[PDB]
């Protein structure tokens, strides 16, 4: 089967960027091959980004130490694409779809091209189905729904990856196919994340796309569009998960600041004009292309969804930087994690004062929506009154009790790691706390009280948990039926212990 393909010659290879000379009729984002030669028995692909006149500046998806001036490049007609489908679940693949966990070749039949236009303007639908993070703070105060892109922004080490991993672990039976995209993240950390996911059995529905720091800047640049294409295939065609056709995907970009750094590197090596903070001009366009592909399509287009959780580290909590403000503008919600709250014992470390979710109550179950309104109001008023709490000691009994209640709620939100709470459990705990059943419990023992209460419901009364989970969608969740056998359980637990 002889075929004739256009070829060019590498006239200048540098820091992972090569000028390919004559490659006429090359598409603007092809995959040039660099065929194997003496000393290199494999192929090193590259992306033909700049289609200049009498020169094609192409980044290299791999080690450029082997490309030599005068080498041939065959312009494969295919625009950059990644393998997608059922075969990728449970595999760690570099952004080109090649497995790196050494568990065998990736089995696939369809290759969805990365860098695709948004799913549509009218094709989307209102976000209604919640994404159960398993963290009380996120699920109650900053809800995340299927098809909503929620940013996880914080300082260098506050729990961003921990929150993303907890969310990924929690989607055990919720019909979600989580995707973890590691951009610029050290290979040992990706190994740790894979080990954590495998330990909790969460690698039977997770795809890990890793472009570590040592790998070329082009791989990190196309790292989030790989994986985003995988999630697009999941939300448009579905993947067989636990015998059910799951069409919901959850993608976590491990760090978009490192992705922006990689794009800045590939742009500056291409000698494109810089912009603010040396980033190229269209970095907002970069991240908007990446994030607007996360949507909840209507029933006519499949009814699938793709939930994105971009992660951004901020230098010295400088939210007003370039990339943080860009991605804050792009996303539909923000989750600020502070080192000050993290050190003060608040383990999830969410700054609920400034963390917002524009979707709001529409991304919460009716039980959660009915119970968490009082939570949010009381927490906001406690934050307001913290000014008096810090100094004034002559405040009336009302203010003292209200500060005490705020502390009760804050200690309630102090969740450990790798212990997600299902929706029924969070609903039960928040109903107990917001209905004054927790007032007599001292603050230092509230976490132990919650753990013991959950053991109580898991062992003594599984039926109340089943009842709460069964009718969590009704318009009026606190029906006398659900109201009884729950207040009874709380009263029994209170009487028996302490």
């Amino acid at each position: 089967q002889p075929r004739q393909v256009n070829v060019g010659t590498v006239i200048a290879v540098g820091d992972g960027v090569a000028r390919l000379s004559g490659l006429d009729q090359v598409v603007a984002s092809e995959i040039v091959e660099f065929p194997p030669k003496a000393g290199r028995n494999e192929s090193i692909y590259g992306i033909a980004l700049n289609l200049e006149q009498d020169s094609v500046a192409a980044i290299i998806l791999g080690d450029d130490e082997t490309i030599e001036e005068g080498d041939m490049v065959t312009s494969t007609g295919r625009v950059i694409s990644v393998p997608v489908g059922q075969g990728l679940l449970g595999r760690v693949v570099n952004p080109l779809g090649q497995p790196i966990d050494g568990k065998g070749p990736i089995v696939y039949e369809k290759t969805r091209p990365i860098e695709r236009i948004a799913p549509g303007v009218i094709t989307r639908k209102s976000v209604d189905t919640p994404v159960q993070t398993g963290i009380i703070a996120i699920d109650a105060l900053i809800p995340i729904g299927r098809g909503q892109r929620e940013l996880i922004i914080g300082d260098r080490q506050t729990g961003k990856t921990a929150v993303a991993i907890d969310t990924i672990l929690n989607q055990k039976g919720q019909g979600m196919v989580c995707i973890y995209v590691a951009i610029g993240q050290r290979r040992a950390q990706v190994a740790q994340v894979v080990g954590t996911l495998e330990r909790f059995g969460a690698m039977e529905y997770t795809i890990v796309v890793s472009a570590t720091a040592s790998e070329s800047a082009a791989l990190q640049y196309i790292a989030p569009y790989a994986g985003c294409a995988m999630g697009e295939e999941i939300m448009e065609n579905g993947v067989m998960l636990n015998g059910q056709l799951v069409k919901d995907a959850l993608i976590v970009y491990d760090d978009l600041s490192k992705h922006a750094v990689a794009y800045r590197q590939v742009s500056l090596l291409l000698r494109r004009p810089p912009g603010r903070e040396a980033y190229p001009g269209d970095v907002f366009y970069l991240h908007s292309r990446l994030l607007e592909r996360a949507a909840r399509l209507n029933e006519e287009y499949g009814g699938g969804s793709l939930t994105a959780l971009p992660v951004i580290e901020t230098q010295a909590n400088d939210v007003s930087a370039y990339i943080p403000t860009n991605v804050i503008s792009i996303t539909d919600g923000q989750i600020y994690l502070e080192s000050d709250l993290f050190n003060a014992g608040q383990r999830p470390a969410l700054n609920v004062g400034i963390s917002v979710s524009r979707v709001g109550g529409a991304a919460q179950t009716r039980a959660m929506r009915a119970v968490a309104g009082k939570l949010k109001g009381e927490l906001a008023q406690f934050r307001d009154l913290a000014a008096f709490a810090q100094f004034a000691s002559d405040l009336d009994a009302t203010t003292k009790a209200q500060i005490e209640r705020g502390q009760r709620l804050q200690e309630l939100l102090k969740q450990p790691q790798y212990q997600p709470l299902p929706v029924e459990d969070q609903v039960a705990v928040l109903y107990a706390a917001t209905n004054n059943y927790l007032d007599d419990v001292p603050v230092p023992l509230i976490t132990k009280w919650r753990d013991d209460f959950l053991a109580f419901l898991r062992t003594a009364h599984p039926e109340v948990r089943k009842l709460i989970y069964d009718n969590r969608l009704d318009r009026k969740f606190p029906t006398p039926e659900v109201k009884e056998a729950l207040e009874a359980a709380i009263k029994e637990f209170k009487a028996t212990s302490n």
């Binding site: 006429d24 009729q25 090359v26 598409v27 603007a28 984002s29 700049n50 289609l51 200049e52 006149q53 625009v79 860098e115 236009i117 948004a118 303007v121 009218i122 989307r124 639908k125 209102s126 976000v127 098809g147 909503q148 494109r272 004009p273 912009g275 603010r276 190229p280 001009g281 269209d282 907002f284 366009y285 908007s288 292309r289 994030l291 607007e292 592909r293 949507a295 909840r296 209507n298 939210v319 007003s320 403000t325 503008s329 792009i330 539909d332 917002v356 524009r358 979707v359 709001g360 109001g377 008096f388 004034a392 405040l395 009336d396």
Partner: protein
């Protein structure tokens, strides 16, 4: 009038034309794609010999370095007319809704037009009758003016927009145009289309009286740059027809950002913090078309997003240089069940002076917002004193301030089918008279929850007597 593409660097395409057939500065290019459709580029710079540098308006992930280009001669042509009513369009004017394409019989007008001359500008500012009490009392609009919204989601900004569209469509013809410039596709679309198709007024949906043009963040910088001009062209057709138009631009800051990205990709040197050198002129070429001539007026109610909270940023400064009033929706007012969350403070207007609204309007608007000028700073003394068991006059001023805050709410004709309450339209004269009587003291001897959700002071009196 056919050329060849030379360079393709991102969304900037350099095309070489014959020497005597070079496209004009703002003409379209319409690169034909293999699978039937076309990629409409917009020229930005004539340079060299027969070479033009154009912005993509599209992906440009499938173009070689030899594709032919078909100059159109005219700038981006967009359908205008009653046919383009109740439909959703992109930057190029191609309808992106499920309905069929626009027929060729509809007139196509160039996207770029000069603003009305100085001779046609009105020599006296005129208040715009919106019907909302808080809007028409503290921060009145301007006929052919601009207004900004500073509020996130969940504060009812969409409902305020819907009420404005319904009021302008009922009281006057009020054809409305909505410009989605760089807004989230989830918020801008399918939470505006559905909330306006479901919303109805006199068995006619709000969406049927509104033209929507949507350039979202996923689109290239050129699309978000020219979506505003597309919306202005659609509104300007109806303005030339003599009908008053309410034009909404969502996140004009995204229009500024699109301009900045276009300039950065075009090789222009940055200005200030990376922004385009032609910032003021680009704002002028768009905001100056929003003006009230003698035959018609285009009132604008834009939404402004400031990066972080920096109002010193050049984009908000240039936006604010072209503003006549600001409306600041507040989370606290929204969560206090008062649906119109327009903060009585932080909502200014340049029409609020005696020489336009009138001496009585200014007087009543100054008596109000004065008892609130402190933001009821008395709240702190109550907090740390238990009201001191007696505050003398302060009790009366607190009661009056709470009464006014409750009274600022007004029923929504678009939310009538949601909250089950008919909407009341309150003219400006009714607003000023009602608030004058309330400040005189006729609102006294009436408890709260009777000024919560009503149209006029007469309605409050009727509720009290019943």
């Amino acid at each position: 009038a056919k050329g060849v593409i030379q360079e393709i660097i991102g969304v900037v395409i350099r095309a070489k034309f014959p020497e005597d057939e070079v496209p004009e500065i703002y003409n379209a290019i319409e690169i034909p794609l293999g699978n039937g459709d076309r990629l409409v580029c917009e020229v930005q710079q004539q340079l060299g010999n027969g070479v033009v540098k154009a912005v993509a308006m599209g992906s440009t992930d499938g173009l070689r370095r030899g594709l032919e280009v078909i100059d159109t001669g005219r700038p981006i042509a967009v359908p205008v007319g009653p046919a383009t009513l109740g439909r959703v369009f992109n930057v190029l004017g191609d309808p992106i809704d499920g309905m069929g394409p626009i027929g060729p019989e509809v007139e196509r007008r160039p996207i770029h037009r000069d603003p009305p001359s100085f001779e046609e500008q009105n020599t006296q500012a005129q208040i715009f009758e919106t019907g909302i009490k808080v809007i028409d009392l503290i921060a009145p609009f301007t006929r052919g003016g601009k207004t900004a919204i500073f509020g996130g989601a969940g504060v009812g900004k969409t409902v305020v927009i819907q009420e404005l569209i319904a009021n302008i469509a009922k009281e006057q013809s009020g054809f409305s145009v909505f410009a989605g410039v760089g807004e989230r596709s989830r918020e801008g679309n399918d939470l505006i289309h559905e909330m306006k198709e479901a919303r109805i007024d006199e068995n006619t949906t709000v969406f049927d009286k509104t033209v929507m043009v949507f350039g979202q963040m996923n689109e290239p910088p050129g699309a978000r740059l020219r979506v505003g001009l597309t919306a202005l062209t659609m509104a300007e057709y109806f303005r030339d027809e003599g009908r008053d138009i309410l034009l909404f631009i969502d996140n004009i800051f995204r229009f500024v950002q699109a301009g900045s990205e276009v300039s950065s990709l075009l090789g222009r040197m940055p200005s200030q913090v990376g922004y385009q050198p032609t910032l003021g002129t680009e704002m002028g070429e768009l905001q100056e078309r929003i003006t009230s001539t003698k035959r018609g007026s285009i009132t604008s109610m834009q939404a402004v997003y400031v990066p972080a909270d920096d109002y010193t940023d050049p984009a908000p400064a240039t936006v604010f240089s072209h503003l006549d009033a600001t409306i600041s929706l507040e989370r606290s007012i929204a969560e206090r069940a008062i649906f119109p969350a327009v903060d009585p403070l932080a909502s200014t207007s340049r029409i609020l002076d005696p020489n336009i609204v009138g001496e009585e309007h200014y007087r009543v608007a100054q008596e109000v917002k004065r008892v609130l000028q402190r933001y009821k700073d008395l709240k702190d003394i109550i907090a740390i004193l238990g009201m001191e068991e007696l505050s003398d006059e302060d009790k009366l001023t607190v009661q009056r301030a709470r009464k006014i805050e409750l009274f600022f709410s007004q029923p929504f004709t678009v939310a009538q089918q949601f909250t089950g309450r008919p909407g009341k339209y309150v003219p400006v004269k009714k607003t000023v008279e009602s608030f004058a009587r309330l400040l005189n003291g006729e609102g006294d001897h009436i408890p709260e929850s009777f000024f919560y959700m009503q149209g006029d002071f007469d309605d409050v009196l009727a509720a009290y007597e019943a």
